[PDB]
Amino acid sequence: NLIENFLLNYSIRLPPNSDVVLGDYFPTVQP
Amino acid sequence: LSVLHLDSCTDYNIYGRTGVGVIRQTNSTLLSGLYYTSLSGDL
Amino acid sequence: VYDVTYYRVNNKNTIVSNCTDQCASYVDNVFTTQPGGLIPSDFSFNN
Amino acid sequence: WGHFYINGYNFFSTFPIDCISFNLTTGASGAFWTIAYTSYTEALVQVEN
Ligand SMILES: *[C@@H]1O[C@H](CO)[C@@H](O[C@@H]2O[C@H](CO)[C@@H](O[C@@H]3O[C@H](CO)[C@@H](O)[C@H](O)[C@@H]3O)[C@H](O)[C@H]2NC(C)=O)[C@H](O)[C@H]1NC(C)=O
Ligand SMILES: *[C@@H]1O[C@H](CO)[C@@H](O[C@@H]2O[C@H](CO)[C@@H](O)[C@H](O)[C@H]2NC(C)=O)[C@H](O)[C@H]1NC(C)=O
Ligand SMILES: *[C@@H]1O[C@H](CO)[C@@H](O)[C@H](O)[C@H]1NC(C)=O
C-alpha cells in the first residue's frame, strides 16, 4: 500500500478524464 | 495537384508511379511507409 | 531502483493497477542495451 | 546527412547537420517515450504488416 500511495500522489498531475500508463523509476516490490 | 478518382478505372500517377487501375479506400492499417508495391514492381 | 516499472492509472471513476503482461507488450518501449550496442531479442519495436 | 524519416519514410531533407537542438515534452498527458542514438549496421530483419 506504500507503493500504491506513492502512485496516488504521483498521478495528481493527470487530467480529470484520462486513462494512462505511467513509466518511471518507481519503488518496486522485490529488492 | 492531388485529384483522386475512386471506385472507377483511372489513369493514375501516384508519387511518381504510373499505370491504369481501380483505386479504392480500404479499412486496413499500415503504420509505416508511403506506398506499397509488388514483386513485379507494380503499385 | 535500477529500471522502469509501468502502472496503469484510471481517473474516470483514481485507480492504480499493475501492468505486467499483455498490456506491458503495448507500451513497454524501453530496453537495456547489450554490449556492442545490440537490441535484445525480446524487444517489441513498437515505435 | 539531413534526411528526415517519419514512420520509416524519407519525406524531406536539408543540408548536412552538425548539431540538433530540441525541447520536447508530452506534458500533463503522463506519456513516456525514448530517444535513441544509433549507428548503421547490416542485419537480417523479419517484417510483418
Ligand atoms: C501510441 O499509440 C498506440 C496505438 O496507435 C498505443 O498502442 C495501443 O495500446 C493499447 C493499450 O494501451 C492497446 O489496447 C488493447 O487492445 C486489445 C484489443 O485486442 C485489448 O484486449 C487490450 O486490453 C487493450 O485494450 C492497443 O491495441 C495498442 N495499439 C497498438 C499497439 O497499435 C501506444 O500505447 C501509444 N504509445 C504509448 C507510449 O503509450
Ligand atoms: C486526403 O485526405 C484528406 C483529409 O481527410 C482529404 O481532404 C478532405 O476532403 C474532403 C472532401 O472534399 C473535404 O470536404 C475536406 O475539407 C478535406 N479536408 C481537408 C483538411 O482539406 C483529401 O481530399 C484526401 N486526398 C485525396 C487526393 O483524396
Ligand atoms: C473491412 O470491411 C469488410 C467488409 O467489407 C470486413 O469484412 C473487414 O473485416 C473490415 N476490416 C477491417 C480491418 O475493419
TrEMBL record, chain A:
In terms of domain of life, where is this protein from? Viruses
Subcellular location(s): the record lists:
Virion membrane; Host endoplasmic reticulum-Golgi intermediate compartment membrane
For this UniProt entry, which residues form the secretion signal? Answer: none
Glycan-modified residues: 9
**Description of how the protein assembles with itself and partners:** Homotrimer. During virus morphogenesis, found in a complex with M and HE proteins. Interacts with host receptor.
What family name appears in the similarity comment?
Answer: Belongs to the alphacoronaviruses spike protein family.
Domains: entry comment:
The KxHxx motif seems to function as an ER retrieval signal.
Query: According to its UniProt entry, what is the function of this protein?
Result: S1 region attaches the virion to the cell membrane by interacting with the host receptor, initiating the infection. Binding to the receptor probably induces conformational changes in the S glycoprotein unmasking the fusion peptide of S2 region and activating membranes fusion. S2 region belongs to the class I viral fusion protein. Under the current model, the protein has at least 3 conformational states: pre-fusion native state, pre-hairpin intermediate state, and post-fusion hairpin state.
- Any idea what this protein is called? Spike glycoprotein
